Design a protein around this ligand. Structure first.
Ligand SMILES: *[C@@H]1O[C@H](CO)[C@@H](O)[C@H](O)[C@H]1NC(C)=O
Lengths: 43, 50
């Protein structure tokens, strides 16, 4: 998943937020099971 | 009555007045002000791909 060679990373969006950030977390998507209320998944 | 209150904080200013487009003149030595960059030079056509 981490391949060789070079892949230049292009810019995406610079945002003038001006806040203090020291921690971060990832958000995932979960689908309702409708049958264990959410379908099992891995990321 | 409409009361306008102006405040300045350590955060960068983002409410600002209108900016004049004016016009572009080429092939002559003219003072140029491009997005805050000032100077003096002749603006010719460019074949460089940005
Ligand atoms: C940002 O938050 C951290 C943790 O609360 C704190 O140590 C740091 O002083 C804060 N930054 C500023 C500029 O206050």
């Amino acid at each position: 998943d981490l391949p060789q060679g070079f892949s230049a990373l292009e810019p995406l969006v610079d945002l003038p937020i001006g806040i203090n950030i020291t921690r971060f977390q990832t958000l995932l998507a979960l689908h309702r099971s409708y049958l264990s209320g959410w379908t099992a998944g891995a990321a | 009555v409409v009361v306008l209150s102006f405040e300045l904080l350590h955060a960068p200013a983002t409410v600002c007045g209108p900016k004049k487009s004016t016009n572009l003149v080429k092939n002559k030595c003219v003072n140029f002000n491009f997005n805050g960059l000032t100077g003096t030079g002749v603006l010719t056509e460019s074949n460089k791909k940005f």
